[PDB]
Structures are given as C-alpha cells and as structure tokens.
Design a protein around this ligand. Structure first.
Ligand SMILES: [Zn+2]
Length: 49
C-alpha cells in the first residue's frame, strides 16, 4: 500500500494520519491513540480518566 513510501519514519507510518491528545496537544499517528482516539497513550489518557 501507499503507507510508508516517502517516509524515513516508515515504522511510524510516516505519521501522516495525525490527530492530537486533547490534553497536551501533541500530534501522533492515530494508532498510538489507544485512549480511544481522544488522548495519546497511558500517562495522558489515564490522567483524564
Ligand atoms: Zn498526551
């Protein structure tokens, strides 16, 4: 597929499809938004509860 073609950070899937933690506001690949697409990973999502 066309995911990770012109990407040095191919592992992070180019970080094309970004959204960001409605807390700190850091942009990341939606895949890392394990807080059900609201916040980034553990520290942040849990901090909102
Ligand atoms: Zn965060």
């Amino acid at each position: 597929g066309t995911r990770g073609v012109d990407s040095p950070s191919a592992e992070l899937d180019k970080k094309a499809n970004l959204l960001k933690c409605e807390y700190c506001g850091k942009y990341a690949p939606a895949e890392q938004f394990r807080g059900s697409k609201r916040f980034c990973s553990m520290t942040c999502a849990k901090r909102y509860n």
